[PDB]
Amino acid sequence: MLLEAIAIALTAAHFGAPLLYYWRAKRWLKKPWDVAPDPTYRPRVTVIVPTYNEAPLIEEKLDNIYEQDYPRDKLEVVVVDSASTDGTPSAVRRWAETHPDLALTLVEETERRGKAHALNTALRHATGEIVVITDADALWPARDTLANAVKWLADPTVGAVSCVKRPRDFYNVLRVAESKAWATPIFHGELAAFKRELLERLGGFPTDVGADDSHTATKIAMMGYRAITPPDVVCVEAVPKRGYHAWRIRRAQHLVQHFAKAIRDGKAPPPFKPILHAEAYLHLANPWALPTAAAALAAAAAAGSLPAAALLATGAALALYKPYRTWTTMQAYLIAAAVKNLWDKE
Q1: In what order do the strands lie in the sheet with 45-51?
Q2: Which residues form the signal peptide (predicted)?
C-alpha cells in the first residue's frame, strides 16, 4: 500500500504549495503601495506593435491606439513587420495616411526572424522615454488605458508596468500581491511598458526566451527596479477561437523557458527572491508531482486496491466543478510545455 502513501503525499505537496503561497500573497495584498501613480507625468511614449501576417486585425488595432486620450504630441507608433506574406506593410500605409496626426513609422526587415529580433530593430527607431509593447490582436478596453499604465511609471524606482487581465482571481492576486511586494515575474503582451533607458541597458530584447515581456520585466526587477501590474491597468485577454490548447501550451512553454533561465541567474534582491523562487517552483516543479501521483494511483488501482480507485473516481468527480479543472488543465499545459521544450531543441 506504499503507493497510496506516496500518491497522496505528492498530492498534499502539490496542492499545498500554491495555497500556502496564495495565503502569503494575500498578506502582501493589504499592504499599501510604496509607490504612487502621478497623473501629470507626460513622457514621450512609443507603442510598438510587432506584426506578422495579421492584415485583418492591424486596421482596428491601430484604431484602438489612435483613440487613446493620451496627448498625441507625446505619442508615436512603430509597427514592426518581419517581411509578411499578406499586404500588412501597407495595410499600415493605408491607415497611416488616413490618420496623419498620429506619428507612425512602419519599419520592415529583410527577413522573418522571430519576435525579439523585430522588437530590437524597432527599438532603435523609437524616440520615447517609455516603450510599450503590445500584441496586434490585443485591444485596450478604455481610452485612458495607456495613460493609466504611464501614470504608474512616474516613480524613478519603477522600471516596468503591465496590466491585470479580464475576460482567475487567484492569478490576479498573485500578480498585484507580488507587485506590491516588489515585482512580479510575469508580464502580459497586451500592454508591456518599459523605461527605454533600462531596455538599452539590457540591451534590447534577448532572443533566447519566448516570454520576452516577462523575461524583460524580470531582468528589470533583478536590477533593482520595480516591475508591477496595478489593478487599475486592465486589459482583456485575447483568446483565439481555434487552436486554444496549442496556444495555451505555447504560452506555458514561454513561461517554463523564462523561469528556467531566470533562476539560473543569482543576484536577486531580497524582496524579489522569494517571489522568483516561488513562481519558478510553481512553474517548473509542482506540476510534475501531480501526474506522478495519478500514475501511482492507477497502478495501485489496477492491481487490486479500491481505495485508490476511489481516489481517482473522486478526482474525476472534482473535475465537474470549474476551479479544479482550470487548475488541473494548467498543470497539464505546464507538463506538456516542459516535455515539448526538452524535445523541441532536439
Answers
A1: 103-108, 75-81, 45-51, 130-133, 192-195, 158-162, 226-228
A2: none
| DSSP secondary structure, 6-47, as one string | HHHHHHHHHHHHHHHHHHHHHHHHTSPPSS---TT----EEE
Is 82 annotated in a binding site? The answer is yes
Residue 137 labelled as part of a binding site: yes
Instruction: List 161's β-bridge partners, or say none.
Output: 193, 228
Resolution, given in Å to one decimal, reads: 2.7
Per the annotation, does 247 bind a ligand?
A: yes
Method by which the coordinates were obtained: X-ray
Do the Cβ atoms of 153 and 128 come closer than 8 Å?
no
CATH assignment of 45-271, given 3.90.550.10, 3.30.565.10, 3.30.70.2190, 3.40.50.1010? 3.90.550.10
Consult the annotation and say whether 54 binds a ligand: yes
Q: Look-up: residue for cell 516603450?
A: 131
For residue 231, the SS3 value is coil
DSSP 53-94: S-HHHHHHHHHHHHT--S-GGGEEEEEEE-S-SSSHHHHHHH
